[PDB]
């Protein structure tokens, strides 16, 4: 059967600024870089950045809600979000509809998120403040 | 400090066929569903399906290379690929890299992959046969 996410691959329009964003700004671990891509890790996550001439820099109003959330502790969340804000990182959402989250964009407009909490914690919170029509299995 | 992927959220145009795809076809566990979304798990992966009127059913020629790969064992790979084929699931790429990979599309055209192999395995292969311009850290 399927056992988890093997890797996340993001198409990027310019390799160097994307590597800098994920490694320097977000603090992910850079393992390899070549003319057309890079491999990073974020804890157990394998992230690939793939240089793609088809990737467009996409404003958030032009893309759907597909997004990628990274885990951060309650102790680190606010200062990390504030550092991104002070660095001029663009945002895409303000309303906290799924808990403690900070919504921000990568250089190509990929929709990213910092989130505090697990799925179990989100289910427990939703039992008290459920989304409309919610059923739990 | 970021510690991993917290969740992957896919925007979907029709919630029922997307739930059927991820739960019934791909075997993920459905934890909750509401009028505009669902939460599933696949091992450690927290997957959210979010009903989004902005999601277009997108042909693979019209999207970039961003994609989401799920882990499967080598022993299970061929029968899972055959299950997807029986269900008429379209393929968007042939494998030409190390480790088994099956590249398939979800109902809205999200680019998915089954992959056998870790980052460590990929890096080992790359060290022996580096991509053009490849540098390691
Ligand atoms: C830091 C780094 C950069 C590059 C890009 N070098 C570009 C050189 S040129 C003269 O063609 O502009 C590759 C690997 C690492 Br690691
Ligand atoms: Mn989210
Ligand atoms: Mn891949």
CSV table of C-alpha atoms and ligand atoms in Angstrom, one decimal:
chain,number,residue,atom,x,y,z
A,1,UNK,CA,0.0,0.0,0.0
A,2,UNK,CA,0.9,3.7,0.1
A,3,UNK,CA,3.0,4.6,3.1
A,4,UNK,CA,3.4,8.4,3.1
A,5,UNK,CA,4.8,11.2,1.0
A,6,UNK,CA,8.0,10.1,-0.7
A,7,UNK,CA,8.9,13.6,-2.0
A,8,UNK,CA,7.4,17.0,-2.8
A,9,UNK,CA,8.7,18.5,-6.1
A,10,UNK,CA,8.1,22.2,-6.8
A,11,UNK,CA,8.7,23.5,-10.3
A,12,UNK,CA,10.7,26.7,-10.1
A,13,UNK,CA,11.4,29.4,-12.7
A,14,UNK,CA,14.8,30.5,-11.5
A,15,UNK,CA,16.8,28.0,-9.5
A,16,UNK,CA,19.1,30.3,-7.6
A,17,UNK,CA,16.5,32.4,-5.8
A,18,UNK,CA,14.4,29.4,-5.1
A,19,UNK,CA,17.3,27.5,-3.5
A,20,UNK,CA,18.1,30.7,-1.5
A,21,UNK,CA,14.5,30.9,-0.3
A,22,UNK,CA,14.2,27.3,0.9
A,23,UNK,CA,17.8,27.0,2.3
A,24,UNK,CA,18.7,30.5,3.5
A,25,UNK,CA,15.4,31.9,4.5
A,26,UNK,CA,13.4,28.9,5.5
A,27,UNK,CA,16.4,27.0,7.0
A,28,UNK,CA,16.0,23.7,5.1
A,29,UNK,CA,19.0,21.5,4.6
A,30,UNK,CA,20.5,21.6,1.1
A,31,UNK,CA,22.0,18.2,0.0
A,32,UNK,CA,22.7,18.7,-3.7
A,33,UNK,CA,22.3,21.3,-6.4
A,34,UNK,CA,22.8,21.0,-10.1
A,35,UNK,CA,22.1,23.1,-13.2
A,36,UNK,CA,18.4,22.2,-13.3
A,37,UNK,CA,17.5,21.4,-9.7
A,38,UNK,CA,18.2,20.9,-6.0
A,39,UNK,CA,17.5,18.4,-3.3
A,40,UNK,CA,16.7,19.6,0.2
A,41,UNK,CA,15.3,18.1,3.3
A,42,UNK,CA,13.1,19.5,6.1
A,43,UNK,CA,13.0,16.9,8.8
A,44,UNK,CA,11.8,13.7,7.1
A,45,UNK,CA,10.6,15.7,4.0
A,46,UNK,CA,12.4,15.2,0.8
A,47,UNK,CA,11.9,18.5,-1.2
A,48,UNK,CA,13.0,18.7,-4.8
A,49,UNK,CA,13.2,22.0,-6.6
A,50,UNK,CA,13.0,21.4,-10.4
A,51,UNK,CA,13.9,24.2,-12.9
A,52,UNK,CA,11.0,24.3,-15.3
A,53,UNK,CA,10.7,26.7,-18.2
A,54,UNK,CA,6.9,26.2,-17.9
A,55,UNK,CA,6.7,27.5,-14.3
A,56,UNK,CA,5.1,31.0,-14.1
A,57,UNK,CA,5.4,33.4,-11.3
A,58,UNK,CA,1.8,33.2,-10.2
A,59,UNK,CA,-0.1,35.8,-8.1
A,60,UNK,CA,-2.2,34.1,-5.3
A,61,UNK,CA,-5.5,35.3,-6.8
A,62,UNK,CA,-4.7,33.3,-10.0
A,63,UNK,CA,-4.1,30.0,-8.3
A,64,UNK,CA,-6.3,27.6,-6.4
A,65,UNK,CA,-6.1,26.7,-2.7
A,66,UNK,CA,-3.5,23.9,-3.2
A,67,UNK,CA,-0.8,24.5,-0.6
A,68,UNK,CA,2.1,23.0,1.4
A,69,UNK,CA,2.3,23.4,5.1
A,70,UNK,CA,5.5,23.0,7.2
A,71,UNK,CA,5.5,22.0,10.8
A,72,UNK,CA,6.9,24.4,13.4
A,73,UNK,CA,6.7,24.4,17.2
A,74,UNK,CA,4.5,26.6,19.3
A,75,UNK,CA,7.7,28.2,20.7
A,76,UNK,CA,9.2,29.1,17.3
A,77,UNK,CA,6.1,30.0,15.3
A,78,UNK,CA,5.6,33.7,16.0
A,79,UNK,CA,9.2,34.8,15.6
A,80,UNK,CA,9.6,32.8,12.4
A,81,UNK,CA,6.4,34.3,10.9
A,82,UNK,CA,7.6,37.8,12.0
A,83,UNK,CA,11.0,37.3,10.4
A,84,UNK,CA,9.4,36.3,7.1
A,85,UNK,CA,7.1,39.4,7.3
A,86,UNK,CA,10.1,41.7,8.1
A,87,UNK,CA,11.9,40.1,5.1
A,88,UNK,CA,9.1,41.2,2.8
A,89,UNK,CA,7.8,37.7,2.0
A,90,UNK,CA,4.4,38.0,0.3
A,91,UNK,CA,1.3,36.6,1.8
A,92,UNK,CA,-1.8,35.0,0.6
A,93,UNK,CA,-4.2,34.4,3.5
A,94,UNK,CA,-4.9,36.0,6.9
A,95,UNK,CA,-8.0,34.2,8.4
A,96,UNK,CA,-6.9,31.3,10.6
A,97,UNK,CA,-9.5,28.8,9.5
A,98,UNK,CA,-7.4,25.7,10.4
A,99,UNK,CA,-5.6,26.7,13.6
A,100,UNK,CA,-2.3,28.5,14.2
A,101,UNK,CA,-1.0,29.1,10.7
A,102,UNK,CA,1.0,31.7,8.8
A,103,UNK,CA,0.3,31.8,5.0
A,104,UNK,CA,3.1,33.0,2.7
A,105,UNK,CA,4.3,32.7,-0.9
A,106,UNK,CA,7.6,31.4,-2.4
A,107,UNK,CA,9.3,33.3,-5.2
A,108,UNK,CA,7.1,31.6,-7.9
A,109,UNK,CA,3.9,32.0,-5.9
A,110,UNK,CA,3.8,28.5,-4.5
A,111,UNK,CA,1.4,28.7,-1.6
A,112,UNK,CA,3.2,27.8,1.7
A,113,UNK,CA,2.2,27.7,5.3
A,114,UNK,CA,3.7,27.5,8.8
A,115,UNK,CA,1.4,25.4,11.0
A,116,UNK,CA,1.5,24.4,14.7
A,117,UNK,CA,-0.2,21.1,15.4
A,118,UNK,CA,-0.9,17.6,14.2
A,119,UNK,CA,-3.9,16.1,12.4
A,120,UNK,CA,-5.0,14.6,15.7
A,121,UNK,CA,-4.9,18.0,17.3
A,122,UNK,CA,-6.8,19.5,14.4
A,123,UNK,CA,-9.5,16.8,14.7
A,124,UNK,CA,-9.8,17.5,18.4
A,125,UNK,CA,-10.1,21.2,17.9
A,126,UNK,CA,-12.7,20.6,15.1
A,127,UNK,CA,-14.9,18.5,17.4
A,128,UNK,CA,-15.4,21.7,19.5
A,129,UNK,CA,-15.5,24.2,16.6
A,130,UNK,CA,-16.4,22.0,13.6
A,131,UNK,CA,-16.5,23.0,10.0
A,132,UNK,CA,-20.0,23.1,8.5
A,133,UNK,CA,-21.4,19.6,8.0
A,134,UNK,CA,-18.4,17.9,9.6
A,135,UNK,CA,-18.5,14.2,10.2
A,136,UNK,CA,-15.8,12.2,12.0
A,137,UNK,CA,-14.9,8.6,11.1
B,1,UNK,CA,12.8,25.9,12.8
B,2,UNK,CA,10.8,23.8,10.4
B,3,UNK,CA,10.6,20.2,11.3
B,4,UNK,CA,8.8,18.5,8.4
B,5,UNK,CA,5.8,18.6,6.1
B,6,UNK,CA,2.7,19.4,8.3
B,7,UNK,CA,0.1,18.8,5.6
B,8,UNK,CA,-0.5,18.7,1.9
B,9,UNK,CA,-3.7,20.4,0.7
B,10,UNK,CA,-5.1,19.8,-2.8
B,11,UNK,CA,-7.8,22.0,-4.2
B,12,UNK,CA,-10.5,19.8,-5.8
B,13,UNK,CA,-13.4,20.6,-8.1
B,14,UNK,CA,-15.7,17.9,-6.9
B,15,UNK,CA,-15.3,16.5,-3.4
B,16,UNK,CA,-17.0,13.1,-3.9
B,17,UNK,CA,-14.9,11.8,-6.8
B,18,UNK,CA,-11.8,13.1,-5.1
B,19,UNK,CA,-12.6,11.3,-1.8
B,20,UNK,CA,-13.3,8.1,-3.8
B,21,UNK,CA,-9.9,8.5,-5.6
B,22,UNK,CA,-7.8,9.0,-2.5
B,23,UNK,CA,-9.8,6.7,-0.1
B,24,UNK,CA,-11.1,3.9,-2.2
B,25,UNK,CA,-8.6,3.7,-5.1
B,26,UNK,CA,-5.4,4.8,-3.4
B,27,UNK,CA,-6.3,3.3,0.0
B,28,UNK,CA,-5.8,6.4,2.2
B,29,UNK,CA,-7.6,6.6,5.6
B,30,UNK,CA,-10.6,9.1,5.7
B,31,UNK,CA,-10.7,10.8,9.1
B,32,UNK,CA,-13.3,13.5,8.6
B,33,UNK,CA,-15.3,15.2,5.9
B,34,UNK,CA,-17.4,18.4,5.8
B,35,UNK,CA,-19.4,20.2,3.2
B,36,UNK,CA,-16.2,21.7,1.6
B,37,UNK,CA,-13.4,19.3,2.4
B,38,UNK,CA,-11.9,16.1,3.8
B,39,UNK,CA,-9.0,15.1,5.9
B,40,UNK,CA,-7.2,11.8,5.1
B,41,UNK,CA,-3.9,10.2,6.2
B,42,UNK,CA,-1.4,8.1,4.3
B,43,UNK,CA,1.2,7.0,6.9
B,44,UNK,CA,2.6,10.2,8.4
B,45,UNK,CA,1.1,12.3,5.6
B,46,UNK,CA,-1.9,14.5,6.5
B,47,UNK,CA,-3.8,15.2,3.3
B,48,UNK,CA,-6.5,17.8,3.0
B,49,UNK,CA,-8.9,17.9,0.1
B,50,UNK,CA,-10.4,21.4,-0.2
B,51,UNK,CA,-13.4,22.0,-2.4
B,52,UNK,CA,-12.5,25.0,-4.5
B,53,UNK,CA,-14.6,26.5,-7.3
B,54,UNK,CA,-11.3,27.9,-8.6
B,55,UNK,CA,-9.8,24.5,-9.3
B,56,UNK,CA,-9.7,23.8,-13.1
B,57,UNK,CA,-9.5,20.2,-14.3
B,58,UNK,CA,-6.1,20.7,-15.9
B,59,UNK,CA,-4.5,18.8,-18.7
B,60,UNK,CA,-0.9,17.7,-17.9
B,61,UNK,CA,0.5,19.6,-20.9
B,62,UNK,CA,-0.9,22.8,-19.3
B,63,UNK,CA,0.6,22.5,-15.8
B,64,UNK,CA,4.2,22.6,-14.7
B,65,UNK,CA,6.2,19.8,-13.2
B,66,UNK,CA,5.1,20.3,-9.6
B,67,UNK,CA,4.1,16.9,-8.3
B,68,UNK,CA,3.5,14.8,-5.2
B,69,UNK,CA,5.1,11.4,-4.9
B,70,UNK,CA,3.9,8.7,-2.5
B,71,UNK,CA,6.0,5.9,-1.1
B,72,UNK,CA,5.3,2.3,-1.8
B,73,UNK,CA,7.5,-0.8,-1.5
B,74,UNK,CA,9.1,-2.4,-4.5
B,75,UNK,CA,7.1,-5.6,-3.8
B,76,UNK,CA,3.8,-3.7,-4.0
B,77,UNK,CA,4.6,-1.3,-6.8
B,78,UNK,CA,3.5,-3.4,-9.9
B,79,UNK,CA,0.2,-4.5,-8.5
B,80,UNK,CA,-0.7,-0.9,-7.4
B,81,UNK,CA,0.2,0.5,-10.8
B,82,UNK,CA,-2.0,-2.2,-12.3
B,83,UNK,CA,-4.9,-1.2,-10.0
B,84,UNK,CA,-4.5,2.4,-11.3
B,85,UNK,CA,-4.5,1.2,-14.9
B,86,UNK,CA,-7.6,-0.9,-14.3
B,87,UNK,CA,-9.3,2.2,-13.0
B,88,UNK,CA,-8.4,4.1,-16.1
B,89,UNK,CA,-6.1,6.5,-14.4
B,90,UNK,CA,-4.0,8.5,-16.9
B,91,UNK,CA,-0.2,8.5,-16.9
B,92,UNK,CA,1.6,11.8,-17.5
B,93,UNK,CA,5.2,10.7,-17.8
B,94,UNK,CA,7.4,7.5,-18.2
B,95,UNK,CA,10.0,6.7,-15.7
B,96,UNK,CA,13.6,7.4,-16.8
B,97,UNK,CA,15.3,7.9,-13.4
B,98,UNK,CA,16.5,5.5,-10.6
B,99,UNK,CA,14.0,3.8,-8.5
B,100,UNK,CA,10.6,2.6,-9.7
B,101,UNK,CA,8.2,5.4,-10.5
B,102,UNK,CA,4.6,5.5,-11.9
B,103,UNK,CA,3.4,9.0,-12.8
B,104,UNK,CA,-0.4,9.4,-12.7
B,105,UNK,CA,-3.0,12.1,-12.6
B,106,UNK,CA,-5.8,12.7,-10.1
B,107,UNK,CA,-9.3,13.6,-11.2
B,108,UNK,CA,-8.4,17.3,-11.4
B,109,UNK,CA,-5.1,16.8,-13.0
B,110,UNK,CA,-2.9,17.0,-9.9
B,111,UNK,CA,0.4,15.3,-10.9
B,112,UNK,CA,1.1,12.3,-8.6
B,113,UNK,CA,3.7,9.7,-8.5
B,114,UNK,CA,4.4,6.3,-6.9
B,115,UNK,CA,8.1,6.1,-6.0
B,116,UNK,CA,10.3,3.4,-4.5
B,117,UNK,CA,13.4,4.8,-2.9
B,118,UNK,CA,14.6,7.4,-0.4
B,119,UNK,CA,16.6,10.6,-0.7
B,120,UNK,CA,19.6,8.7,0.6
B,121,UNK,CA,19.2,6.2,-2.3
B,122,UNK,CA,18.9,9.0,-4.8
B,123,UNK,CA,21.9,10.8,-3.5
B,124,UNK,CA,24.0,7.6,-3.6
B,125,UNK,CA,23.1,7.1,-7.2
B,126,UNK,CA,23.9,10.8,-8.0
B,127,UNK,CA,27.3,10.6,-6.3
B,128,UNK,CA,28.2,7.8,-8.7
B,129,UNK,CA,26.7,9.5,-11.7
B,130,UNK,CA,26.3,13.2,-11.0
B,131,UNK,CA,23.8,15.3,-13.0
B,132,UNK,CA,25.2,18.1,-15.1
B,133,UNK,CA,26.6,20.8,-12.8
B,134,UNK,CA,26.0,18.7,-9.6
B,135,UNK,CA,27.6,19.8,-6.3
B,136,UNK,CA,27.1,18.1,-3.0
B,137,UNK,CA,27.1,19.5,0.5
C,1,LIG,C1,26.3,28.7,-5.0
C,1,LIG,C2,26.2,27.9,-6.2
C,1,LIG,C3,26.0,28.6,-7.4
C,1,LIG,C4,25.9,27.9,-8.7
C,1,LIG,C5,25.6,28.6,-9.9
C,1,LIG,N1,26.9,29.2,-10.5
C,1,LIG,C6,26.7,30.0,-11.7
C,1,LIG,C7,28.0,30.4,-12.3
C,1,LIG,S1,27.8,31.4,-13.8
C,1,LIG,C8,29.4,32.0,-14.1
C,1,LIG,O1,27.5,30.5,-14.9
C,1,LIG,O2,26.9,32.4,-13.5
C,1,LIG,C9,26.0,26.5,-8.7
C,1,LIG,C10,26.2,25.8,-7.5
C,1,LIG,C11,26.3,26.5,-6.3
C,1,LIG,BR1,26.6,25.5,-4.7
C,2,LIG,MN1,-3.2,24.5,5.4
C,3,LIG,MN1,9.3,12.8,-8.6
